């Protein structure tokens, strides 16, 4: 059969009858306006469905149109620069088709429009008669100037090519590839439909070795992240969250970005949806907009609670489809604390047992089964590509306390934590990443890259970490007894720590010279500031005063280092100027 009838609605939940061949967690369309809901129980012929939309005016006997699939995304061209909700309805098309400001509760508008034409070209290896496995790229759609949309096979099916398309412009409904198999020949277009709860298959997990060049100086040096890794940041009101989310989209080596705003707010999501279309990317030629490589999943809390719980799985499935092409995806879940409040309402409506602070029993397992979808892996398919997914999930704990069933379960799964602080924003220290509470566990896998490319960076930062760790025990005694009892060895390492927090860590994002500090500038700005430290370690073992008053101009040359603009200043000049500062310190001592 194909139709069911309603037989009773008691709120969001509909106990639809006459549905015998219905599967569990399969999406249906309830009512005359076709409200979307999923089958959540199945008692014989009746199927108990909870509706995503608002049931109001749904009669007994309305048709329940079965689809036959779980909650799934449409993967194909027309996705870059598009804004979806958590269940992938196009917000930029709903506001254009209907000419209104509301979501009309019955829109089964397709996520990818079937009216635009895409310039398709085949892989030029595939002929009529070739055997093809799942994951093989059989075409490339030049979607933008930046992104080449490699049309791939679905991982499910397999067969032999009997009809390939000629090079030309097609819709997303035109048949492009046709595959003979044992029983029946299958034909399918450029769009593939993959369930969002199902992990994408892949050949082999690889270890993560290459770092993410985020652009900031404290994050690329002291607490480094790898592409293929999982991080976490505190999601407070204002510490630094707007510039960590936007410098990682402008100034990173990641090929595509997916930004998942997951039930955020009314005006805090309208701020994001109007600031990301007006960002600018500096590619090797001319300037470009960031929305040629960025997709957004936008959810306010007026939206359905199951379109807020499945926003994370929509975002990670778009991040995994662009991983399998060979790109290096970076995904930022804007809030995972507002996602776990969408689990508590889903489980609280099903009368599930609360585990801890109201959250359900499967909270720590659903967070682990999402963060373990991130990693640099070797993709499927005979073209022999590799991809990556990096996940930056922000956590907004109640009251800023790190003891919570979501926050303490995030810190046990993520490896990197960039601890943003409220107090460093009140002292105008930008970016406000704290160094004591932060950590990074990818350092042991990043030495093999650092010994082949920079080779004087690994012992450089461990000296910079023990200086600032020494400063916190020195800060309690400067008000206790004072600097009058402070040692000649300890008063110098306090004075280079103030040089560290002013020159290396503090980085103004609106100045045109420090918007993107590359790692050649980053290794230079610390190698001339740690070499200043240990030559000041033997200068007290031979006077603290005469090194501060006579080298005050050398104190200025380190305090105008961050100014050595690398956009308009060559790399080899900056290396040349940094070597000249190294000789001035070795000659003055």
């Amino acid at each position: 059969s194909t139709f069911g009838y309603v037989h009773g609605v008691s709120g969001p939940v509909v106990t639809a009858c006459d549905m015998a061949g219905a599967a569990m967690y399969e999406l249906v369309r309830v009512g005359h306006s076709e409200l979307v809901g999923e089958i959540i129980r199945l008692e014989g012929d009746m199927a108990t469905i909870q509706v995503y939309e608002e049931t109001s005016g749904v009669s007994v006997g309305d048709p329940v149109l079965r689809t036959g699939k779980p909650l799934s995304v449409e993967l194909g061209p027309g996705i870059m620069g598009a804004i979806f909700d958590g269940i992938q309805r196009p917000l930029s098309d709903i506001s254009s088709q209907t000419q209104s400001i509301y979501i009309p509760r019955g829109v089964n508008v397709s996520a990818l429009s079937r009216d635009v034409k895409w310039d398709f070209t085949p892989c030029k290896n595939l002929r009529v008669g070739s055997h093809i496995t799942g994951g093989d790229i059989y075409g490339i759609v030049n979607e933008n100037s930046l992104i080449k949309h490699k049309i791939m096979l679905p991982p499910r099916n397999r067969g032999t090519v009997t009809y390939i398309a000629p090079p030309g412009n097609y819709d997303t409904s035109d048949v492009v590839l046709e595959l003979e198999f044992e029983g029946i020949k299958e034909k399918f277009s450029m769009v593939q439909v993959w369930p969002v709860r199902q992990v994408r298959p892949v050949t082999e997990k690889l270890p993560a070795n290459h770092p993410l060049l985020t652009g900031q100086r404290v994050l690329d040096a002291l607490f480094p992240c790898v592409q293929g890794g999982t991080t976490a940041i505190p999601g407070a009101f204002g510490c630094g969250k707007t510039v960590i989310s936007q410098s990682l989209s402008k100034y990173s080596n990641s090929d595509v970005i997916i930004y998942v705003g997951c039930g955020e707010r009314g005006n805090e999501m309208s701020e994001v949806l109007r600031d990301f279309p007006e960002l600018t990317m500096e590619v090797d030629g001319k300037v470009e907009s960031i929305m040629k490589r960025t997709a957004l999943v936008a959810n306010t809390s007026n939206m359905p609670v199951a379109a807020r719980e499945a926003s994370i799985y929509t975002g990670i499935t778009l991040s995994e489809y662009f991983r399998d092409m060979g790109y290096h995806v970076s995904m930022m879940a804007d809030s995972t604390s507002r996602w776990a409040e969408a689990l508590r309402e889903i489980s609280g409506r099903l009368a599930e047992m609360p585990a801890d602070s109201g959250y359900p029993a499967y909270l720590g397992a659903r967070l682990a089964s999402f963060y373990e979808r991130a990693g640099r892996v070797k993709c499927l398919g005979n073209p022999e590509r590799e991809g990556s997914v990096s996940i930056v999930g922000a956590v907004s704990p109640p009251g800023g306390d790190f003891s919570d069933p979501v926050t303490s379960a995030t810190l046990g799964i993520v490896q990197v934590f960039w601890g943003l602080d409220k107090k460093l924003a009140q002292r105008k220290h930008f970016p406000s990443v704290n160094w004591l509470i932060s950590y990074s566990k990818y350092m042991r896998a990043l030495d093999e890259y650092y010994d082949k490319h920079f080779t004087e960076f690994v012992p450089l930062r461990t000296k910079a970490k023990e200086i600032l760790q020494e400063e916190e025990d020195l800060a309690e005694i400067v008000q206790l007894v004072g600097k009058a009892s402070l040692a000649e060895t300890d008063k110098i390492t306090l004075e280079v720590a103030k040089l560290i927090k002013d020159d290396f860590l503090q980085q103004n994002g609106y100045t045109p010279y420090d918007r993107f500090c590359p790692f050649y500038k980053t290794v230079g700005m610390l190698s001339n500031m740690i070499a200043f430290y240990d030559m000041a370690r033997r200068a007290v073992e031979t006077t603290w005063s005469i090194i501060r008053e006579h080298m005050g101009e050398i104190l200025y040359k380190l305090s105008s280092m961050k100014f050595k603009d690398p956009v308009k200043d060559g790399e080899a000049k900056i290396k040349a100027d940094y070597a000249q500062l190294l000789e001035d310190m070795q000659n003055a001592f």
Binding site: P207, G375, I413
Partner: protein, 458 residues
Amino acid sequence: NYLSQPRLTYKTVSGVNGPLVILDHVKFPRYAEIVHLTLPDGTKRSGQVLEVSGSKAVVQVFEGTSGIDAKKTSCEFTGDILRTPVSEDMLGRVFNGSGKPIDRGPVVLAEDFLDIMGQPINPQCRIYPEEMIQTGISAIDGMNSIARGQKIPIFSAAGLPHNEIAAQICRQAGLVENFAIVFAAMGVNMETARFFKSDFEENGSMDNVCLFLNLANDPTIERIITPRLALTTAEFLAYQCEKHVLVILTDMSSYAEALREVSAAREEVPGRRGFPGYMYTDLATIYERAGRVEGRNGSITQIPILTMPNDDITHPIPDLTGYITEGQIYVDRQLHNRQIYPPINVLPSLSRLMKSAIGEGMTRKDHADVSNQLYACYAIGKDVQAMKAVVGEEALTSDDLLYLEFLQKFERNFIAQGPYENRTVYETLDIGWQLLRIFPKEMLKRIPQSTLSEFYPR
């Protein structure tokens, strides 16, 4: 002896909700019986009958009910309870949570089929563990020494190096002719699986290591049968092939969190913090499967790692573990920020079988007395350190400055040893006697005057 009748194959599903599938018209259903679902889209899933009532059978599936029809799915009743093909060739291979190989290998050739639930050993024919395992860690082999047949967890937290000291006690596991290590990983990451796999191949130990790794993305009802599989091969090696087995059940908090979701889906009666009322008996069915028996020369020792939530020893994961097992090993967060590599806070640590495994014939005479004084000098000096932070650094008795001289020389010299150093028990007791030299001879109350005259002047 053997089943010869053909298998009934029902398409008579009549209810499914959560992870539970309810079949009807089942002819004589059996409790704890294994079924084999085949989905309408062709994939296979296993199950276990959890409650029968007349002609109905409430089976829970191991992979989740996502996609299970009410008309098209077909359920085949294997007429027996869950048995696994066990062999001597399950030693050097890796497996997933359910039963299957991962290292591109074939299936097990089944020397016999053992029930994974086991059957409890007769307490009259169970002998006491006596032979102390020298594991090369000074916080263990000094004050919390394990025996051969002892269950002893590693009480850890999130982020602390409990995986690293798990691989450290695998290499240095010997007596004061190697251990056949069985490793069960449940709810672990990808890097944690690769850290244990590439360490067992680094030291050449993967000729006698059977890895049972179940990742975090694997289904959460396969985490229930993962320690039952890794202990039914460990009983095959130890109680039939006469082998000395070291079982490590890492992340036991991921087992019991996967036990809470199944019981909350059945709407069972909750205990503390949502965990079921049978959490003590379900943990003890995999903890009490250890020790050695009188008729055999093999043994099985369990070191189950668990991470306590919020560094709390009163959570139901480490509290109910202390009642079943025989003492714990407590790594600490405060000793990890000071970059001591084994951060083993010895104060809430314990070894209940260390009294019978040390002594004159076992290690030497002074072992039972220096460990009682190293424990009391550590406990007083932490009370003194909690007093000088309130009173001051100068308003103390001059005897209270030796307890600050002890602790700063205790944590860096006794317990801190490095990731590849394996101190013997005679190395440890000569390091532990040095720290008691800074005290007078009549301030050591736990050591009598007899063995003070033979060891303290040195």
